[PDB]
Ligand binder design. Structure first.
Ligand SMILES: Cc1ncc(Cn2c(C)c(CCOP(=O)(O)OP(=O)(O)O)sc2=O)c(N)n1
Ligand SMILES: Cc1ncc(Cn2c(C)c(CCOP(=O)(O)OP(=O)(O)O)sc2=O)c(N)n1
Ligand SMILES: Cc1ncc(Cn2c(C)c(CCOP(=O)(O)OP(=O)(O)O)sc2=O)c(N)n1
Ligand SMILES: [Ca+2]
Ligand SMILES: [Ca+2]
Ligand SMILES: [Ca+2]
Ligand SMILES: [Ca+2]
Ligand SMILES: [Ca+2]
Ligand SMILES: [Ca+2]
Ligand SMILES: [Ca+2]
Ligand SMILES: [Ca+2]
Ligand SMILES: [Ca+2]
Ligand SMILES: [Mg+2]
Ligand SMILES: [Mg+2]
Lengths: 524, 524, 524
């Protein structure tokens, strides 16, 4: 067998059937003879390739396979890899390298020092020392991406390796099963359970690894047993809990003092599947107030090590959430009361307040919609206004890197064909990965793109105003016609200049058979 | 003085007056109070920021200054940095980092292990250990980028450093002059000159560092004295010689055997300002035929070390070319005969042959036009059909990384306002950095963009055919409306479906006052 | 030809005939069939291997070739590489790697991520992608080590590569000549010369790259023409000037304020072949006083970039010193007056003051002796008391890394068999690389080792006293019998408890036919 045939067999046997890519010559011997049972998804720029793959992996809860071209292709994707690192996305990034005989002279298209290029944004990065090693290296990549804490990996393969003979002993790779589905030993788990049962006013904080693990329902049971309020950890990449459940208390503000104030009076705070904490703004103060103890369950040693406070347990989130939910006592305390309905913001017949948009989306979208957010000045309002009952309903760039939501929304929609995906993207953010729209058109992936057009990098203008910072250049983005960009890439385009037009356009978009972009004129 | 004021003073004193950027919050304390004598050039994605800066630096023959946001912004630019490495572009890449007090907890927007992120594509990469070090680190960056061999550098600066007090002793940085304008010692230079004078059939090969050094005219004198044919080294990023000079012999094919055959019978081959050699295709054979000696002059130790053949001298190209041109004897041999006019390809009233496009551009463009090439299946024909008399007339992605020409053409046009820039870009390549078009519109930088629309990744289809490779996915890019994309970003848009429409559109574009995109229907 | 035969041919053709090594199995296919015209120098630990090679390279002014075993051998040498980086030592470090078929499984003796292991202490680090690339990679290593600024490089080679067929086209590597012997262009050199001629009170500062280049005599001529005092730059790794020449002013103190005070009143300070500056102690103040301009000539871009003051020129030190010495005018100013004789310190019939030792060495040693210094509390006195007339007469650990002098003294003595080497090493420092003594015994390399036994890490005790730092552990090293250690490794051993015994032992050592260690009881 050739290295090509053995490698595709390994991929198939390990559950991979899709290649997200942008082709080049170094990968031609990999891509030729492409197997009929595999699908290739082309995108026009590598940030888009990796963003699509990332959304696919996060929504599918399985690894996604990528093929890029050499250093330039890899490099074009490194912003996307920053997000994938922070979201623990299981991405297998392969990159085509020059033929081994041309690497020393540094021929055009040579990826110099290839394994160092994606660092520090990958869990493992490698170039094999021989062709016959390629299947084994691919096995390593698959498992490294997939073991907790999941994350992106990188494998560079010389052009000429694919046609070489494989080692027959590579067959032992095909059906390897590698598990990291582990939980705290019984003795120490019983201590934790007793601490939770004994708490007088517990609180729960959930992060994105809960949604990745599909541990959401277990966390609902846990919260109901403990009669505890539930927050989402700051800078949330995913939504880990039903947002109209009575226990839900919303997105934590991403500041040190704000969080310790929120947690004051709670004697035990159990954090599951989040870093402690993904703060953002400068908000100095106490990490915790006196009388609060924090206990973190995390799938990631790097998270446990860097927490500035609390105990930690490094384990699989799915396994731990299920165990905890089924072991804790039912508290006799009263169940928390649901948060009230958010206020309706006054809206005239002009430009749309973002709150209006979110309220209308919540009114018209299916109950099993999936939302993506890259509307950076409106996140707090979005989190208050969308009733997200189901797992897998929200994605936000986990490293804050813009250019995620537009391509990721296409990958999510590919992963969840029955669930309508609605990406809410600012006019600034929409540009970073604009060319991803073409993939939605070409493959007829029916994502809806809602462009929040305020003409500015609003979150930056806001921050400069808080700072009283004057004479800051580059904060405005006038003169972009998003309907024309959509037309450029073959996607149906609508405008919404007022509330009536927003409802009419959303009605049209929801019944369409293909992707749709709606440009919304929002208040500036 | 603050670190901000000292740093901007250093930049001004060192000749920097322009910041190419995409803003974020980590850089707000750098960008606020932006000096009135500086200009900020915004682009909508960081590949575009760096590509624009790169074209500006290459055409201006001086460093260009960039400011990006953290890891995601840096990462979005890494493909662009691959090209800048290969072109020896002097780019000073700064990236905003989180406040020092938030780096340990890895707050959102922290650039983890920042100095490692752009490696191996930078000459120097650094994060200062204290605020007061920032001016000194900036000095280091400026000089590292600017010393031969020029190249990109990276500096990560925490948000909170800018407002801190600077060290008064930083004033010693302001007027430092650092020179690498060096040439071979007299004794060894006399040996080289004697070897050139004694050659019976010398040949010259020129690469991009000749054009960077503006050594073109000196090389013309050298060629005329030695009565030697002149080739451009393969995979050419720049044009180092007038292409209708009698000695000019064109672009070398990027293959080992092809080049040694071309050089057969030439007893001494002098290579200036090129790697030896930037081969591309697999074309095995002899590096040199018997009877050929090669001597390379390079500004880059890494080039000299990796050449598989020949002697080398590591020195400044400008200094060496000027010395050699003025020291060699006038040979009594006959001056080479100019290459004939290229053939006119038969053209019907339908889709355009690329040869037709290039011939029409050469007919209608000013004699001091500047061309950029990212039409990857048509490069050989382009090089034969454009009369480029002047230095600085050609750019091509030096690492083969697509997404260079569209933004670089804007930066070149900013650098050379009197010289009409014409970027010839394939329909595939145009997508990688499409959003750069907006910068041309916003700043009214009057670049002309010629999109070669054949509906395919033609160079890849070509290569797959040579290989007889079947079932290769992802090679076609149907369904892109480039006039609509231009409209999207505010750039005047024309179509050319046939030769009459090509001439009419070029006539319109050449008289326009702003940027123009022309979508040309080319033969598939 | 095999890769082994081609590689040894390349080495021989490039002037390498000695391998400094500690063997292991991964290198057995390299070391077998060892050519009869090569010499292998074994040392018992890899810090010793590299230190010996380093002294050999520095004294020979040519590259030295090393072979180590995998990661553990490489790692044992990394302290030695820190010194070699700072001294610009041209070292070619090869390390044996596992067979390619065993690298993926990470068999015992695999060097994981090998090229990253020695970073950041090497100029270039590489593992070839195929066996046939090994000769080309070796060529790259040779030239990278040897081009200015010289320095160490690293090449990792899989076991199985050596026996494979080489590429016949590797013959083009054998006789490549690569030059970096360059100087400032004539126009800018004339400006520099005019600035030197016009100075009213010039000063010269020389660093180790002057001695490496054998530019010492040229610098003497330069100093005499300009009638300028000459200092050695701080933390001096080498001696660049005759220390009893009338212009010589000694070792600069390694502090910011001390140096600017020393240079006050000097209108032009010309620094050659040194960083600006290798400060050590905290001594804050002005980099330069008003009225002093500094101009640096350096072979190293990294030095030129980081200087906090002055202009710089990046060029070959040999070429620049020769040009400057022969172009400057003869000043009519008076020649500086020689420094007086140092004072004789009162010495009783007990333990030796270090000043006594140095005075006695200067009295009894040949005029062409070579000294090494790793007696860290006595350096200033050593520099005042030794008349070093000739180039190549002094070495000191260039990164301050102890464990250099003992092995380096053996390599220097191998390089300079007619020049008596005398290493003056503290009792603390002697331990780091003690096993190097065996190589001197086995190869009968007749180095004299003078152990300054004060029972303490004296320079650290001194510093703790300046700090008024109390309760510092680990500063005393009682209970080491150096005569017994010498016996252990086969080296003749003497003691000197008083001045009479010091003279008698030195008389014995100087007439011996093999290496000798003298343990001197020095004042504490
Ligand atoms: C790749 C990248 N570049 C720049 C930024 C900086 N950035 C920028 C540019 C923001 C403005 C986004 O504007 P928008 O129009 O998408 O949304 P708002 O107007 O609601 O802020 S928010 C922010 O962090 C970033 N996070 N990621
Ligand atoms: C960033 C990146 N991704 C992918 C490639 C691979 N690539 C691709 C995708 C090519 C096709 C470019 O198509 P085009 O339409 O711009 O021009 P032609 O149709 O004339 O080839 S040529 C080539 O090397 C690349 N070099 N750089
Ligand atoms: C490898 C290493 N480890 C530790 C040190 C720290 N060090 C130490 C341990 C010194 C004391 C050396 O003692 P000595 O006996 O050799 O000489 P003195 O008694 O004259 O100081 S000086 C100094 O910088 C070092 N420089 N290098
Ligand atoms: Ca409602
Ligand atoms: Ca699915
Ligand atoms: Ca906006
Ligand atoms: Ca014509
Ligand atoms: Ca200009
Ligand atoms: Ca095309
Ligand atoms: Ca004396
Ligand atoms: Ca010798
Ligand atoms: Ca001591
Ligand atoms: Mg990197
Ligand atoms: Mg290392």
């Amino acid at each position: 067998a050739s290295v090509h045939g053995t490698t595709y067999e390994l991929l198939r046997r390990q559950g991979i059937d899709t290649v997200f890519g942008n082709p080049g010559s170094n990968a031609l011997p990999f891509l030729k003879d492409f197997p009929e049972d595999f699908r290739y998804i082309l995108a026009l720029q590598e940030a888009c390739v990796v963003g699509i793959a990332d959304g696919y992996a996060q929504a599918s809860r399985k690894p996604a396979f990528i093929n890029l071209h050499s250093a330039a292709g890899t490099g074009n994707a490194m912003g996307a890899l920053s997000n994938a690192w922070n979201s623990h996305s299981p991405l297998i990034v392969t990159a085509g390298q020059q033929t081994r005989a041309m690497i020393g002279v540094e021929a055009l298209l040579t990826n110099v020092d290839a394994a160092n290029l994606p660092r520090p944004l990958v869990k493992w990065s490698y170039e094999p020392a021989s062709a016959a090693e390629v299947p084994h290296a691919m096995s390593r990549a698959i498992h490294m991406a997939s073991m907790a804490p999941q994350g992106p990996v990188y494998l560079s393969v010389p052009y000429d390796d694919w046609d070489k003979d494989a080692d027959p002993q590579s067959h032992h790779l095909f059906d390897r099963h590698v598990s990291s589905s582990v939980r705290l030993n019984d003795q120490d788990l019983d201590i934790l359970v007793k601490a939770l049962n004994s708490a007088s006013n517990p609180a729960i904080v959930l992060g994105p690894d809960v949604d990745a693990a599909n541990a959401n329902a277990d966390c609902v049971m846990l919260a109901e047993r403990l009669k505890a309020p539930v927050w989402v950890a700051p800078s949330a990449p995913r939504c880990p809990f039903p947002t109209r459940h009575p226990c839900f208390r919303g997105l934590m503000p991403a500041g040190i003092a704000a969080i310790s104030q929120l947690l004051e009076g709670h004697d035990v705070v159990l954090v599951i599947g989040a870093p402690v904490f993904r703060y953002h703004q400068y908000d100095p103060g106490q990490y915790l107030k006196p009388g609060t103890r924090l206990i973190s369950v995390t799938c990631d040693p790097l998270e446990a090590a860097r927490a500035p406070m609390g105990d930690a347990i490094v384990a699989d989130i799915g396994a731990m959430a299920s165990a905890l939910a089924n072991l804790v006592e039912e508290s006799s305390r009263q169940l928390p009361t649901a948060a009230p309905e958010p206020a309706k913001v006054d809206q005239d017949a002009g430009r749309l307040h973002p709150e209006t948009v979110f309220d209308t989306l919540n009114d018209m979208a299916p109950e099993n919609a999936i939302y993506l957010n890259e509307s950076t000045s409106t996140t707090a309002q979005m989190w208050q206004r969308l009733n997200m009952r189901n797992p897998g309903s929200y994605y936000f760039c986990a490293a804050g890197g813009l250019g995620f939501a537009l391509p990721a929304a296409i990958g999510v929609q590919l992963a969840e064909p029955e669930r309508q995906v609605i990406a809410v993207i600012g006019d600034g953010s929409a540009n970073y990965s604009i060319s991803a729209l073409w993939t939605a058109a070409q493959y007829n992936i029916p994502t809806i793109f809602v462009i929040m057009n305020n003409g500015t990098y609003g979150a930056l203008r806001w921050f400069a105003g808080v700072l009283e910072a004057e004479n800051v250049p580059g904060l405005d983005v006038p003169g972009i016609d998003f309907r024309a960009l959509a037309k450029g890439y073959g996607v149906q385009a609508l405008k919404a200049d007022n509330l009536e037009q927003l409802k009419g356009s959303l009605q049209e978009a929801l019944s369409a058979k293909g992707p749709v972009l709606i440009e919304v004129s929002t208040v500036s």
